[PDB]
């Protein structure tokens, strides 16, 4: 203008949106229990 102020208005850039935070549960896989060696005892079946 006569005073130095601009006629055409300014551009308003869009701000960035807040992102959505993500989490996860990674999982493991260990081996199972393997059977030991069997020993024969001295007692009968109802006692053992």
């Amino acid at each position: 203008t006569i005073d130095g102020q601009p006629l055409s208005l300014s551009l308003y850039a869009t701000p960035a949106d807040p992102s959505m935070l993500l989490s996860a549960a990674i999982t493991a896989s260990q081996g199972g229990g393997d059977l030991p060696h069997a020993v024969m005892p001295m007692y009968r079946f109802p006692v053992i």
Binding site: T27, A28, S29, G31, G32
Partner: protein, 49 residues
């Protein structure tokens, strides 16, 4: 062409009604999945065995 347009429109409408994403429907409906041995799959194997 208009069948494809109507299909894409109503699929997008059902998607945004169900509050899912295209990635979510792609997870539930894909066919190009991995072939790697996941620990969850290993746990399923040892449990079901």
């Amino acid at each position: 062409l208009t069948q494809l347009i109507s299909f894409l429109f109503q699929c997008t409408q059902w998607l945004t009604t169900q509050k899912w994403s295209v990635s979510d429907v792609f997870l539930m409906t894909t066919d190009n999945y991995s072939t790697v041995l996941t620990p969850d799959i290993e746990n399923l194997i040892t449990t079901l065995s």
